[PDB]
């Protein structure tokens, strides 16, 4: 990984010493950019709904993963699922139990450094994950998005800005979520998430990382060439609301 500072070096390191699972997937891959292009072409909203317990901005909830999940399955088109365990309070059983329980396409989200680690999404049941590019080295993202890619799974590949994104085009990434509220600082800032939105390609399937709420801002972002929308806590803590945002 690259070297990093605070907690996002703490969740580095735990990630390297993370145990791999046994396990036989029995489930197909249910592509999450292909069904999110089906639902842009069906004029449907396309929110991605995310199952946490805790972040580090301080959310901390406790529902049901499996009503949550069966309850997304009628409205979502996908599902972000945390499996990170000292911040996000997440775990490889649950993603199991989600993913053995609905069938719409689940992303693994977690800080992924190492290949067992997707082997584990894989053998989990996860369709697809998350990679960051500001944890990883270059050489590593690209071996990482390979690696995803020989399992079928087509990565989410997290930019934070300018530089992200010129390391996430190079190595020919194809499905990109943009980050609005810096995930470290904390700081929010749409207008910089605008400006990556509209330096992007249009052949990449665009993913807007938080920083939604309301049907107006999803609208305004749509024109702007965003292909889904990933909403979390406020979802933890009104499921219901996601019908309204559709």
């Known amino acids: 990984p690259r070297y990093l500072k605070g907690w996002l070096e703490d969740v580095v390191q735990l990630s390297l010493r993370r145990p791999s699972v046994r396990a036989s997937r029995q ?4 592509s999450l950019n292909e069904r999110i292009l089906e639902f842009n072409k069906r004029n449907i909203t396309a929110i991605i709904a995310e199952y946490k317990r805790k972040d580090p901005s301080g959310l901390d ?6 009503e949550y999940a069966k309850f997304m399955e009628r409205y979502a088109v996908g599902l972000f699922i945390s499996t990170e365990e000292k911040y996000f309070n997440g775990s490889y059983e649950t993603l199991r139990k989600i993913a053995s329980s609905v069938s719409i396409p689940i992303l693994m989200y977690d800080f992924i450094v190492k290949e067992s680690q997707i082997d584990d999404a894989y053998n989990l049941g996860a369709d697809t994950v998350a990679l960051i590019v500001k944890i990883l080295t270059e050489r590593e993202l690209e071996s990482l998005l390979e690696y995803a890619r020989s399992y ?3 990565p989410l590949i997290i930019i934070n800005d300018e530089n992200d994104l010129d390391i996430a085009l190079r190595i020919g990434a194809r499905f990109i979520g943009i980050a609005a509220r810096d995930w470290e600082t904390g700081e929010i800032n749409k207008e910089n998430q605008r400006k990556l939105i509209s330096m992007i390609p249009s052949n990449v399937v665009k993913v807007a990382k938080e920083g939604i709420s309301e049907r107006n801002e ?3 972002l ?3 060439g965003v292909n ?3 909403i979390g806590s406020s979802l933890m803590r009104n499921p219901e609301k996601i019908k309204e945002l559709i």
């Open 61 to 66: 909830v406790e529902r049901d993963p499996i």
């Open 218 to 220: 999803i609208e305004e």
């Open 152 to 154: 079928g799974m087509e």
């Open 27 to 30: 489930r197909p891959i249910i």
């Open 228 to 230: 889904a929308f990933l």
């Open 222 to 224: 749509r024109k702007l």
